């Protein structure tokens, strides 16, 4: 039981970093979403001038 | 390794991309993975490295030759995603 | 700089071996890898998002729309701002995180030395040849309660005794 508890020694100090940096790496990409809007716009513009 | 080397048309692979698949295939890491899972595992591990060990990809691009440090860093970077 | 975050992620995978059956934390790593792979291919796929007015406009000698669509793109050149909307519910999630984390951390930092002291207590305080049953009634009055109730109800059988402690009688 000592060994089973001592497996949980430095979990909290590291998982408080895990939680934060994990949700940041999830959720810091709406910039890329709004970049995708401009990318598909320029994609359509290149396509239609290719048609012209 | 047989199910590994399939490759769709119009899908060439750079040398920096081809190295880690070989390094995983030699060192038996694919053995615990399902035989059908290999195809998604390839692209998964590639996007894994391109996301993360992009420096190692540049090292393979620049050198074309793996040092022992690149070998061990490659080993760690493989066995990381081999844990999934 | 995300390589340190993913190094910490695989450290949390080899420590999440201690918790098998994580329903959506590994799925949270899955979603962050998914949209990270999406955004890196999106930025590598991205051109300089424009129509080349020098070459690719003058390729069309019958131009007539390239000024129109070019000023249409330069019109929507302020596309849309991003979404840094969460600063109130996300801090509540990490508030519950720091709450339960420091609960766990304080409890394990107490109980580690507590059970180490329990091991040291078992180390030098085992009178396994000279302990008194009155000291057992003193350390546990539950002994006296079960003895008196075992007499008063009349279940003079002692069940589960004869297996490891044989009856050593004549018959």
Q: Can you tell me the distance from the alpha carbon of C5 to that of B52, in angstroms, rounded to the nearest whole number?
A: 9
Q: What is the CATH number of the domain that holds B84?
A: 1.20.150.20
How many whole angstroms separate alpha carbon C24 and alpha carbon A22? 12
Burial class (CB in 10 A: 0-12, 13-18, 19+), C163: exposed
Question: Closest Cα partner for C9 from A27, A17, B43?
Answer: A17
Residues 16-75 of C with CB under 8 A from B: 33, 36-37, 40
Among the partner-chain residues B51, B83, B84, the one whose CB lies closest to the CB of C2 is B51
C77 and B CB contact within 8 Å: no
The domain spans of chain C are: 8-111, 119-171
Q: In chain A, what residues touch C36 (CB-CB under 8 Å)?
A: 25, 29
Residue C16 CA to residue C32 CA, distance in Å, equals: 17
Whether A41 sits inside 8 A of C49 (CB atoms) is yes
Query: Position of tokens 């180390």?
Result: C123
Q: Does A26 touch chain C (CB under 8 A)?
A: yes
Cβ atoms of A7 and C18 closer than 8 Å: yes
Q: Cβ neighbours of residue B83 under 8 Å, at least 6 residues apart?
A: C10, C13, C14
- Identify the chains in contact with C, defined as 3+ C-beta pairs within 8 A: A, B
Burial status of residue A42 (CB atoms within 10 A of its CB: 0-12, 13-18, 19 or more): middle
Q: In this complex, which chains have at least 3 CB pairs below 8 Å with chain A?
A: C
CB contact under 8 A, C112 and A32: no
User: B28: helix, coil or strand?
Assistant: coil
C-alpha distance across the termini of chain B, in Å: 18
| Cβ A25 vs Cβ C36: under 8 Å | yes
Which residues on chain A are in Cβ contact (under 8 Å) with C57? Answer: 49
The total number of structural domains in chain B stands at: 1
Q: Tell me the two tokens of residue B37.
A: 């899972």
Q: Nearest chain C Cα to B54, which residue?
A: C3
How buried is residue C5: exposed, middle or buried, by Cβ count under 10 Å (0-12/13-18/19+)? middle
Q: For B83, which of C10, C36, C37 is closest by C-beta distance?
A: C10
Nearest CA in chain A to C58: A49
Rounded to whole angstroms, what are the CA distances from C25 to A32, B41, B61, C156? Answer: 23, 20, 34, 55
Q: CB of A24 within 8 A of CB of C9?
A: no
The rounded distance, in Å, linking the Cα atoms of C67 and C84 is 35
Report residue A21 as tokens. 């940096």
Size of interface B-C (CB pairs under 8 A): 23
Supply the range of the domain harboring residue B11.
Answer: 1-84
- The length of chain C in residues reads 171
Technique behind this structure? cryo-EM
């Amino acid at each position: 039981r000592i060994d089973s508890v001592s497996q949980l020694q430095n979990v909290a100090e590291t998982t408080k970093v895990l939680f934060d940096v994990s949700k940041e790496t999830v959720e810091l990409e709406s910039e890329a979403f709004e970049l995708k809007q401009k990318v598909e716009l320029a994609h359509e513009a290149k396509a239609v001038l290719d048609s012209w | 390794l047989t199910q590994l080397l399939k490759q769709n048309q119009y899908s060439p692979l750079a040398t920096e991309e081809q190295v880690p698949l070989i390094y995983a295939g030699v060192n038996g890491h694919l053995d615990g993975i399902e035989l059908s899972r290999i195809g998604e595992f390839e692209s998964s591990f590639l996007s894994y490295l391109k996301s993360n060990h992009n420096e190692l990809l540049t090292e393979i691009r620049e050198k074309g030759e793996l040092s022992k440090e690149l070998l061990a860093s490659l080993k760690s970077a493989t066995e990381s995603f081999v844990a999934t | 700089a995300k390589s340190a975050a993913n190094k910490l992620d695989w450290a949390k995978v080899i420590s999440s071996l201690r918790i098998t059956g994580s329903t959506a934390t590994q799925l949270s790593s899955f979603k962050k890898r998914n949209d990270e792979a999406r955004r890196q291919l999106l930025e590598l796929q991205s051109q300089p998002t424009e129509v080349d007015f020098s070459h690719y406009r003058s390729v069309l000698k019958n131009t007539s729309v390239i000024d129109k669509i070019e000023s249409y793109v330069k019109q929507y050149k302020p596309v849309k701002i991003d979404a840094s909307k969460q600063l109130q519910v996300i801090e509540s999630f990490e508030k519950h995180a720091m709450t339960n984390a420091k609960e766990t951390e304080s409890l394990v930092s107490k109980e580690l030395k507590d059970l180490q002291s329990t091991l040291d207590n078992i180390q030098s305080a085992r009178p396994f040849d000279e302990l008194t049953v009155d000291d057992l009634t003193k350390i546990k009055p539950e002994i006296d309660a079960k003895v008196e109730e075992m007499v008063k109800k009349g279940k003079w059988d002692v069940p589960g005794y004869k297996d490891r402690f044989g009856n050593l009688n004549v018959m």
